[PDB]
């Protein structure tokens, strides 16, 4: 930790990191640079509530565990020179660093079939990308969603409550494959074909003409508005060009380092160690770019502090489901705690491995989800016929460990 | 560069980059800790010429110039504190360090099915291990080799020189899936049954019981010795325990620098950036070892130099066929030189990705392999029609670039 400090990006990964700084103790300056023009808020609420209710003022960050900061919004870090160390800005200006921190998140991913599109197509991402979705979600007109992941899921949930007609193109046999287990999916499935959404599995769009999007089996979709959701690439392209260690994102320790001295990186822009599979990945999370943030600033203000260490969650809102995923998706056993079904959705998935708990899922089952994150942060190894077993509460497993 | 350096390793990266560090101008100490009690030595002779002839003495690497080093032979780093600078040794010593290379190579994959074997079980990557499997190329007796990769293979000629019966076992439809295009390898499995060797594609080994070695398919194959060459594993366990980002092998820059200040990393322990792909690899290469061993040493000495930049290529030794690989197996064209046949066996295979080479591979074809390499280094896009017909010349095809 060499004063001053300058962070590159303002998202919730920066804003965790800086107030964790200022909390640690550190009183030097700290700098932020943030591309977009906008009080920093938080993500999630755009593809959930916001798209409801639209009131940007209910989505902003609490920068106020983060006093005397310099927030540089609607401005652009263009490069950084490591050796001068100093960070080129789009406005003309310089500024000096003694430590450097990336946390310029990621991108969403075009689709390549329809850059030549000539009907509205969208992506999910920002503020500004949530405004734009939600004023062309006209009722009883058409929309069109590529992807079948988190975003397009939520999206696809919004839109039916909305009264949008919707129809979903996927390339996979099922949704979310990237991060959740195939029995969630399979529900899921189920429940948004119960809503009325129109899913293409196996499916990918290869062009567009007026007005209509055309798939891969030679058929095909009209639509008023495409929003496409395939995933995101990393923000990575000045730690490239500064020389850094990137593959589609910027690889970082346990202590946030990226391989050039004085510089770390935090948040979606990183690929890291998952503890529960032991491989460098992109951890794509609201509760990674919370988590990493402190955990990086702690162990920078006082080296003794152990290098991050939290396993992944996440948590994703579509309509009537209120869906939490910790750990990983499989193992080599499942347990089910509860029914299945669509009548009052409501159960557990405990994914295994050797008997040792290595992912959850709680589907509108929050008060279990809590335990079982703490049973897997030990690697506990329950009973599994009480696991099963619905008079066991989980709770008092978790205490008992 | 701070003086004293300390590298850990004594194969062909530790060696380039020492010599490489001398012949730049650095004057302060050396030192290298090798864990094998053997003057330093090169390995592709292993599995060719010296499997033949047996003479250590002919495969020795020239450390003449590196001068004034002290080669700490038959000695193990066990740890080291990227806080002290130190380096902690087998032998009870602790060596100090200013910059400090991790250069430790990567160890052959067991197989798990074989682990309770009682018949002899053996890898090839050691001088050790070459002198082990030497011993038992007893003519008329039946080797079985676990892996139809270059290791596999180079073996298997071998051991058909010298009278024995080879039978192999390959997971995939094909060999030499790692790296060698799909024209390349459906040849070379075509030479390889030519010459006696029982290949089985699809196949794996599930165990074994009295001397005979049991497959997926319900069936058995009876053999005196096993050799395993399944691939290798990065040895990176000093590098994951003292916090550095590695995920089966070390991740470098293209300075060879890792996560920790003041440590750096080289040859087939790390991690880097293909720049053909543009995706991260562990590159296996003698090459590779060599190359990035003097690149980061270079640019250590003189930091104007520029980072690690060359493309990967290798080569493999196969009885009656010298093949040379460079650059990626396949792009979106191929193009064939020559016949491909078992009647002296000629030809040159060129990757193209729009017009561009990506890739080239010459079998018994060596004149033509430096000019296509430099065609690849430069990303040519020479006239494919020229490419094909036999009476263009490479050579002047390059020299023109
Ligand atoms: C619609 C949506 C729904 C989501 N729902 C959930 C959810 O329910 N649960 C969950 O766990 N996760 C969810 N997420 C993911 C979560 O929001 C992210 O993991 C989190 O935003 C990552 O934070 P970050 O700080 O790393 O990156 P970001 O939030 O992307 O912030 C990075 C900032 O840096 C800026 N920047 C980039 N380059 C530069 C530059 N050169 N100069 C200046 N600034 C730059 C970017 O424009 C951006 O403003 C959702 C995300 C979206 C978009
Ligand atoms: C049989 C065989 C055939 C090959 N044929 C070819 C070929 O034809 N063409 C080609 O391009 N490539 C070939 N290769 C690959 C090539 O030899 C390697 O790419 C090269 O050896 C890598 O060099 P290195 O210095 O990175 O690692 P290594 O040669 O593995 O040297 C690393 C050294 O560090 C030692 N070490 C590990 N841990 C410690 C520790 N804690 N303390 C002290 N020492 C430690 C290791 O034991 C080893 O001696 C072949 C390899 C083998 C084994
Ligand atoms: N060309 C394509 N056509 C159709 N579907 C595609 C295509 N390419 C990928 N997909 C599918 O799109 C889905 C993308 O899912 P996510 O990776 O969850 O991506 P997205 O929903 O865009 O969200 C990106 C990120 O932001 C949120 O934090 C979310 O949790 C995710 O981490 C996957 O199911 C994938 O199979
Ligand atoms: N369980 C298995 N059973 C049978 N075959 C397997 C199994 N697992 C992997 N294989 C096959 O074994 C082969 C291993 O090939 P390489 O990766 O070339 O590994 P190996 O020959 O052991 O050599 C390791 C390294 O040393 C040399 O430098 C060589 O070039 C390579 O880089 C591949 O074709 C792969 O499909």
């Known amino acids: 930790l060499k004063a001053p400090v300058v962070v590159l990006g303002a998202g919730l990964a920066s804003v965790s990191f800086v107030a964790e700084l200022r909390q640690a103790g550190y009183q030097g300056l700290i700098t932020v640079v943030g591309d977009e023009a906008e009080r920093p808020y938080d993500r999630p609420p755009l593809s959930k509530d916001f798209m409801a209710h639209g009131d940007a003022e209910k989505i902003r960050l609490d920068c106020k565990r983060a006093p005397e900061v310099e927030w540089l919004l609607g401005v652009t870090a263009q490069s950084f020179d490591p050796q ?40 999910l991402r920002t503020l500004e990308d949530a405004r734009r979705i939600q004023a062309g979600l006209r009722p009883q007109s058409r929309l069109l969603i590529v992807g079948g992941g988190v975003i397009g899921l939520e999206l696809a949930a919004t839109a039916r409550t909305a ?3 919707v129809s979903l193109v996927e390339t996979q046999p099922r949704l979310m494959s990237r991060a959740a287990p195939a ?36 058929t095909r979709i009209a ?32 202590y946030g380092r990226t391989t050039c001295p004085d510089v ?17 990945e992109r951890i794509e999370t609201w509760s990674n770019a919370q988590n990493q943030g402190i955990a990086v600033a702690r162990h920078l203000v006082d080296p003794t502090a152990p290098g991050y260490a939290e396993l992944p969650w996440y948590w994703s809102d579509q309509g009537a489901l209120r869906i939490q995923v910790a750990g990983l998706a499989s193992g080599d056993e499942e347990i089910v705690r509860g029914e299945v079904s669509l009548d009052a959705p409501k159960f557990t998935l405990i994914e295994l491995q050797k008997g040792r708990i290595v992912g959850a899922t709680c589907v509108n089952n929050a008060r279990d989800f809590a335990p079982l994150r703490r049973l897997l942060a030990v690697g506990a190894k329950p009973d599994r016929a009480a696991l099963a077993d619905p008079a066991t509460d989980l709770r008092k497993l978790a205490a008992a460990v």
């Open 183 to 218: 029995t969630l999916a399979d529900f899921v499935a189920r429940y948004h074909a119960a809503q009325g959404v129109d899913l293409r599995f196996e499916r990918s769009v290869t062009g567009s003409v007026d007005g209509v999007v055309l798939l891969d089996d030679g």
């Open 223 to 254: 639509a008023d508005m495409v929003v496409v959701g395939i995933g995101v690439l990393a923000n990575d392209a000045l730690a490239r060009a500064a020389g850094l260690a990137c593959d589609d994102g910027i690889f970082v320790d346990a």
């Open 84 to 123: 001068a160390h100093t960070v080129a800005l789009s406005d003309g200006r310089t500024l000096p660093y003694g430590t450097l921190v990336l946390a310029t998140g990621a991108a969403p991913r075009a689709l390549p079939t329809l850059q030549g599109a000539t009907m509205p197509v969208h992506t």
């Open 163 to 165: 009264g949008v007609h």
């Open 264 to 280: 770390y990186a935090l948040g979606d822009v990183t690929r890291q160690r998952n503890p529960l599979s032991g491989r460098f």
